């Protein structure tokens, strides 16, 4: 009943989304994933969003926004009450400009307020493929 949407599409659970676009500012690159977490039930549900896996180049950092934009490298959102219109979700990955490519890789899951292991309601895997991905 809880899904992640990217662009116009509901993702299958555990989908993988590749982001290749980057913007440059002050010798630092930024790549961004954007989507929505949607609760398709008539009854609202309280969830927490977590980055459950993170793979970055050495001086990379990430920034999660879900309910609130969290500080750099903070992996857990606040509790958010989600319904049918959905809650925006974004993940920004920032890292040094390089002539060489690499892939930053993250997993985001939505959990019931509990946060109990194995209770994931929806999961997306996000690959930031910078300059070919390496």
Author numbering: 28 to 161
Quoted passage from the original study:
The 23-kDa CTD-containing PorA was digested into a fragment composed of Q28 to R171, and the C-terminal 75 residues, which corresponds to CTD, were degraded into small peptides. Thus, we purified and crystallized the trypsin-resistant fragment, termed PorA-N. The structure of PorA-N was determined at 1.3 Å resolution. The C-terminal 10 residues were invisible in the electron density map, and therefore, residues Q28-G161 were modeled. The structure of PorA-N adopts an immunoglobulin-like fold composed of 10 β-strands. FimH is a tip protein of Type 1 pilus and binds to mannose. This structural similarity suggests that PorA-N may bind an unknown molecule.
PorA is translocated to the cell surface without the T9SS translocation machinery and localized on the cell surface in both A-LPS bound diffuse form and 23-kDa CTD-containing form, and thus PorA is a novel type of T9SS CTD-containing protein. We found in this study that PorA impacts the PorXY-SigP signaling pathway that regulates expression of the T9SS in P. gingivalis. PorA is the first T9SS CTD-containing protein involved in gene regulation of the T9SS component proteins.
